[PDB]
């Protein structure tokens, strides 16, 4: 106590060279980091035509969790499951004269963009999930309108990576249910009701609404200041 003293440092201008501070706001980030951040910025600074910016509306957290829980009951065969099915099918058709129907009818989520588009055009899809982050977006921009025209319930959902986990891939960009088990028909109907309430019933209204046009932090503050002064006087 008597040997230690308070020696406060004067960190004001012209004194006591500044302490190490969090400069993460001022980091000269690599070019790829700057590019991805400013691409995200520019995509909302520009006015986004309504075909895009209908994808900023995604399934809410709870409805998405319910949808993904339902879709997780219809995962496709992994390599091990397919190998086991194939051996139990061969060792059955060889001996018991089965008509290659020694395995039951599979009930699996349908994936692959071309496959799901074909199912939508054939009205076989009972529910379509469209990833919101498909990097070339033209692969899925027509999907909400295609589903709306074919009367197929669709939800724009967060994560091609999540759909990839659904279908045992890294990314999937779509995930469809064409048939569902009887114990899950009611869950599918309720979830389709929620999903149509969020996307398909709103489609005619979101199709005429532009997105983007959002200013940055500083421009927003400047516009708020000038609207407070000029507009409210």
């Amino acid at each position: 106590n008597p040997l230690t003293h308070s020696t406060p440092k004067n960190f004001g201008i012209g004194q006591a060279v500044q302490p190490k501070r969090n400069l993460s706001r001022y980091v000269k980030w690599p070019e790829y980091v700057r590019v991805q951040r400013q691409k995200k910025i520019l995509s909302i600074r520009l006015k986004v035509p309504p075909t895009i910016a209908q994808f900023q509306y995604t399934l809410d957290r709870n409805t998405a969790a319910e949808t993904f829980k339902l879709f997780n009951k219809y995962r496709p065969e992994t390599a091990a499951e397919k190998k086991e099915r194939l051996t139990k099918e061969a060792a059955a058709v060889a001996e018991g004269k089965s008509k290659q129907d020694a395995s039951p009818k599979p009930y699996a989520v349908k994936y692959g963009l071309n496959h799901v588009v074909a199912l939508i055009e054939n009205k076989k899809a009972k529910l379509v999930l469209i990833a919101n982050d498909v990097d070339p977006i033209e692969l899925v921009v027509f999907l909400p309108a295609l589903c709306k025209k074919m009367g197929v319930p669709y939800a724009i959902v967060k994560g091609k990576a999540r759909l990839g986990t659904l279908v045992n891939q890294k990314t999937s960009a779509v995930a469809a249910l064409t048939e569902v088990r009887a114990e899950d028909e009611a869950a599918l109907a309720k979830l389709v009701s929620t999903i149509d309430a969020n996307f398909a019933d709103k489609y005619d209204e979101v199709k005429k609404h532009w997105g983007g046009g959002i200013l940055g932090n500083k421009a927003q503050a400047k516009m708020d200041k000038r609207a407070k002064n000029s507009d409210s006087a």
């Binding site: 590019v35 309504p50 588009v117 033209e138």
Partner: protein, 67 residues
């Protein structure tokens, strides 16, 4: 599949959606190097039409040329 829709949509270059995508992507390409590896085709339908297959050994490179 989706490639027919991609092909028809790619022909509406002066539509609002394609104009927006053009502006954003031209900015991104300009920010990148003059020649740089592209992770995937920007137009998968066009790449398939021109002979690209999504297998190991096929490569896409983006290149900027003065007009």
């Amino acid at each position: 599949g989706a490639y027919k829709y991609l092909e028809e949509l790619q022909r509406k270059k002066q539509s609002d959606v394609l104009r927006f995508l053009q502006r954003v992507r031209v900015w991104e390409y300009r920010q990148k190097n003059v020649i740089h590896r592209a992770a995937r085709p920007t137009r998968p339908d066009k790449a398939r039409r021109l002979g690209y297959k999504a297998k190991q050994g096929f490569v896409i490179y983006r290149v900027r040329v003065r007009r």
